[PDB]
């Protein structure tokens, strides 16, 4: 599809079998979700955003299907304030931005 | 322009009579850029992201040329790291997110 951004670029993402909703963020180089329980193996890791540093379970590999487009990567999870899908996984369903 | 997300968006602007390198984001409501010696009257803001809040200044009807396409509207200038576009002038230059 074709998305303006009068509104914020929210959109239905399925991960680990749950349904959630997840921000389009071009501005994130990688994608961070809110807490939630993933299976499998995780790494601790730090990412910065404009208020400063956080700690983030670092999984990869992770499945995640974005508005029916497939995507398989790694998958931040902390205390972010947001869902936001970064530029890992929009790359892998072929997002791009045009103006 | 198509603009693929491989790297991050950056694309030059033009705001105060200074070129600069900022960011196409999406995920960005408002506009934000690194600390600048802007004239005019201000009001203060707080806006919040990864790692917490930062305190801004907001100045409101800024030109701000594109990759030549002109926009005005609110800009936030405060300690960011980087010079971010947000949706607010994102969508007068014709922005959009496909795939
Ligand atoms: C609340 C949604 C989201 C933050 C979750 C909003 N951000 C825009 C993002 O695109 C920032 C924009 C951003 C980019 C780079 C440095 C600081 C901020 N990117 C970001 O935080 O990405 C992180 C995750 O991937 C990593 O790559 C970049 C940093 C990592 S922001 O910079 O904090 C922000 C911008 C405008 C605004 O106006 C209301 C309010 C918040």
Same mark, same amino acid.
């Given at each position: 599809?074709?998305?303006?951004?009068?509104?914020?670029?929210?959109?239905?993402?399925?991960?680990?079998?749950?349904?959630?909703?997840?921000?389009?963020?071009? =501005?994130?180089?990688?994608?961070?979700?809110?807490?939630? %329980?993933?299976? $499998? &193996?995780?790494?601790?890791?730090? +990412? @910065?955003?404009?208020?400063?540093?956080?700690?983030?379970?670092?999984?990869?590999?992770?499945?995640?299907?974005?508005?029916?487009?497939?995507?398989? =990567?790694?998958?931040?999870?902390?205390?972010?304030?947001? %869902?936001?899908? $970064? &530029?890992?996984?929009?790359?892998? +369903? @072929?997002?791009?931005?045009?103006?």
């Amino acid at each position: 599809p074709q998305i303006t951004l009068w509104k914020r670029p929210l959109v239905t993402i399925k991960i680990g079998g749950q349904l959630k909703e997840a921000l389009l963020d071009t =501005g994130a180089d990688d994608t961070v979700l809110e807490e939630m %329980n993933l299976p $499998g &193996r995780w790494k601790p890791k730090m +990412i @910065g955003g404009i208020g400063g540093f956080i700690k983030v379970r670092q999984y990869d590999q992770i499945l995640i299907e974005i508005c029916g487009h497939k995507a398989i =990567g790694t998958v931040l999870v902390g205390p972010t304030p947001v %869902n936001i899908i $970064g &530029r890992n996984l929009l790359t892998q +369903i @072929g997002c791009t931005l045009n103006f």
